[PDB]
From a paper:
We reveal that regulation of c‐di‐GMP hydrolysis arises from a domain‐swapping of the “regular” cNMP fold, which undergoes significant rearrangements upon binding of stimulus, communicating a series of conformational changes over 40 Å to license a productive state at the EAL dimer interface. C‐di‐GMP turnover was increased ~8‐fold in the presence of cAMP or cGMP, further supporting the proposal that cNMPs are activators of Bd1971.
The structure of the Bd1971ΔEAL construct was determined to 2.45 Å resolution, enabling us to trace residues 4–111 of the sensor‐hinge–C‐helix region of the protein. This truncated variant retains the CRP variant dimer interface observed in the full‐length protein and has two clearly empty cNMP sensor domains. The Bd1971ΔEAL structure reveals that the relationship between the cNMP body and hinge/C‐helix dimer interface has changed relative to that of the full‐length cAMP‐bound form, such that the apo/bound structures can be superimposed on one of these elements but not both. This conformational change upon losing ligand is best described by the realization that the C‐helix interface is essentially unchanged (between apo and bound states), and acts as a stator to allow the cNMP body to swing‐out relative to the central twofold axis. Alignment of the bound and apo‐forms using the C‐helix interface (residues 97–110 of both chains) reveals that the cNMP body rotates ~50° relative to the plane between the C‐helices. Residues 81‐86 spanning the connection between the cNMP body and hinge helix comprise the fulcrum for this motion (identified using DynDom; Girdlestone & Hayward, 2016, labeled “cNMP link” in Fig 6B and C), resulting in the largest translation between apo and bound structures occurring at the distal end of the fold (the β‐hairpin element of the cNMP body shifts 25 Å, as depicted by an arrow in Fig 6A).
Residue numbers in the entry:
A (entry chain A): 4 to 111
B (entry chain B): 4 to 110
Write the structure that this text describes.
Amino acid sequence: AAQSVDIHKDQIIFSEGDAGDCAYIIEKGRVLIYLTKDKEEIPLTILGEGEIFGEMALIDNQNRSASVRALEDVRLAIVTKQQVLERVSTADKVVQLLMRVLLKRLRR
Amino acid sequence: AAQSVDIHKDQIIFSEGDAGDCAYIIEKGRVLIYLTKDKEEIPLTILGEGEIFGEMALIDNQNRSASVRALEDVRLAIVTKQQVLERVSTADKVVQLLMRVLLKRLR
């Protein structure tokens, strides 16, 4: 059962270093991917509706490489490891094979 | 129109260094992925029916990182950038987004 959550403007959705198991697809609003060094916000990217972030938690098994803050109220679809497996297994044969070898290459 | 090609036993399908625009799915036979150093064949992998290789040509169009020889008569399905785009565009939303970030990261 796919799930969604609301997060309010200016909330940090997650931070550089956090453990994470899931990715997020933006259904509403916008987020800023940023790092921080020195006590200084260094922005990388702004993402809006239809876009995914947090994806490396679904692939590898490390921590968040960047922090993400909501620039406005957001509604996020939670993508889990289980859902990925399920969707990939129902997908087109060629798309399957491609995802599977691309996923392997990205792992390392 | 999807296309296939027959490659005879011992034909080099492509080589380390070649420009390439497509990937292949093996419908028949087997192929050896190899490198060569000092005129010495160093085998990596044997691939057979149902498997894909050459996939990086669909990602970045830099040259082949390994050579591939048919060990026996093969039939390969040609996978083009256009076909991938078409299938990706009909696919599940989550599968779409995922493909798209794999392509982004592996360039």
